[PDB]
């Protein structure tokens, strides 16, 4: 009996009764160092253990999972390198910031021009959050990575109006955008549980940097770079920075990201959006 069920890809076998020829009609069954350099780039971020998201390094597409007949392009050096985006400024009234990937890099560098000439897209990313403060400051940040981060609206506040987020909200670019309701993350989901996703705490009395290695997470081997945004990047201060008068009032935050193992397919004419 050939297996047409939905569990056939797993390596775990179950004991299941079936009275028919199709296996999906069966029952449920009982269960049994370093100096990081992308190509030519360097950061200082210390030290030793950094967070690999879901315990997988970014790699290429295996031949079993790729249905594309064409041979993909792999511009190793020109694509994969540290890209420093626009700097933010922390304020006592600040709320948060969210970036969409790979939205920010579509307009920047060779990586941006290849995503325009090519239809499909695959890459891993490397996120580096950068914040600096003296030993007299205090505060905490939460840097998270949320696969498939939707943006919900307030429905006008009465709840009876149907409202959708505009294009500028869902496609921020390298300038990011600010959250108007950090507690629900503007998704209707709590901030307290945000740490279920890969996260790193930036605490001003311990570490000034954060690094998250994000693999490629999608239901399909290749995806479109312009239409579909994979995962968001949330920097939300949990504890407000507090400093006595006379210290430095402007504390910037810098986001430097790099792609890892980027494959492009389906060469075509230039398409902006």
């Amino acid at each position: 009996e050939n297996s047409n069920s939905a569990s056939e890809g797993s390596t775990i076998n179950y004991t299941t009764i079936n009275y028919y020829k199709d296996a999906y009609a069966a029952s449920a069954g009982r269960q049994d160092a370093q100096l990081t350099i992308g190509n030519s780039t360097i950061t200082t971020q210390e030290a030793a253990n950094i967070v690999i998201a879901y315990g997988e390094w970014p790699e290429y597409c295996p031949d079993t999972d790729a249905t594309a007949v064409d041979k993909p392009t792999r511009p190793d050096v020109s694509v994969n390198r540290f890209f420093t985006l626009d700097t933010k400024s922390w304020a006592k009234d600040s709320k948060g910031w969210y970036w969409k990937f790979p939205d920010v890099l579509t307009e920047v560098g060779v990586f941006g021009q290849n995503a325009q000439f090519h239809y499909l897209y695959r890459s891993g990313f490397c996120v580096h959050v950068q914040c600096n403060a003296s030993k007299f400051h205090q505060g905490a940040l939460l840097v998270a990575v949320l696969p498939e981060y939707v943006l919900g609206t307030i429905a006008g506040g009465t709840g009876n109006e149907n409202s959708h987020p505009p294009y500028a909200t869902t496609q921020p670019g390298q300038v990011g955008a600010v959250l108007t309701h950090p507690y629900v993350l503007d998704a209707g989901i709590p901030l307290s549980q945000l740490t279920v996703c890969p996260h790193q705490w930036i605490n001003l009395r311990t570490n000034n940097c954060a690094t998250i290695i994000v693999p490629y997470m999608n239901t399909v081997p290749f995806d479109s770079a312009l239409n579909h945004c994979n995962f968001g990047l949330l920097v939300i201060p949990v504890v407000p920075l507090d400093f006595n008068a006379g210290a430095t009032s402007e504390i910037p935050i810098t986001v430097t990201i790099a792609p890892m193992c980027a494959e492009f397919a389906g060469l075509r004419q230039a398409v902006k959006q």
Binding site: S40, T41, I42, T43, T44, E46, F82, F83, T84, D86, T87, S89, V108, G109, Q130, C131, N132, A133, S134, K135, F136, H137, Q174, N208, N244, G246, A247, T248, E250, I251, P252, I253, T254, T256
Partner: protein, 193 residues
């Protein structure tokens, strides 16, 4: 490793000691440009104070990878990170930081490391390179080395709000020279008595 003079101005000629260091201060806007200079050692400019520069005057053609080291003389409570980039020839000084990231850059932190070594790679259309100057010989231009504020220079209460960085330059193992030559610097207008 000898002191490179990044700060060379027409207001520093009266006090020559101000020429060995360039200031770093807290900024209102983020991403402001601090220092920019050309990377050609045998050219009139910052590189004339380097022992490499005075020994590259006796030789015409030079090939190799250089190194430019920076040193932070500020306080112990000063924290910040600055981007240090190198732009291959053909461009001008990058207008903003988003155009200076596309070169070969290094991110370097004050509060951790007090010194950084930037290795200028050898990128050339020729095996050797002559000394670039204005007009027709500028086709040997090496590049442009820039220093950018990435985050900011953060100071606590009581520590000075200004800081000085000293530049240092040297050569790598593969640096070579050839075609020995007279030098431009020394001038004898009258008999030595």
């Amino acid at each position: 490793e000898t002191i490179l003079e990044v700060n060379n101005l027409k207001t520093n000629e009266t006090t020559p000691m101000q020429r060995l260091c360039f200031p770093v201060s807290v900024q209102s806007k983020t991403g402001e440009l601090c220092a920019a200079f050309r990377a050609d050692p045998g050219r009139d400019g910052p590189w004339q104070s380097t022992i490499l520069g005075q020994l590259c005057r006796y030789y015409t053609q030079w090939s190799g990878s250089l190194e430019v080291t920076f040193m932070f003389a500020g306080s112990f409570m000063a924290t910040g990170k600055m981007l240090i980039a190198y732009t291959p020839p053909g461009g001008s000084v990058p207008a903003d930081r988003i155009t200076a990231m596309l070169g070969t850059h290094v991110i370097w932190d004050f509060g951790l490391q007090s010194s950084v070594t930037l290795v200028v790679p050898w990128i050339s259309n020729t095996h050797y390179r002559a000394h670039a100057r204005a007009g027709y010989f500028d086709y040997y231009t090496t590049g442009i080395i820039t220093i950018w504020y990435q985050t900011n220079y953060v100071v606590p209460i009581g520590a000075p709000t200004t800081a000085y960085i000293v530049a240092l330059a040297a050569a790598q193992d593969n640096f070579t020279m050839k075609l020995c030559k007279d030098t431009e610097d020394i001038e004898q207008t009258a008999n030595i008595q």
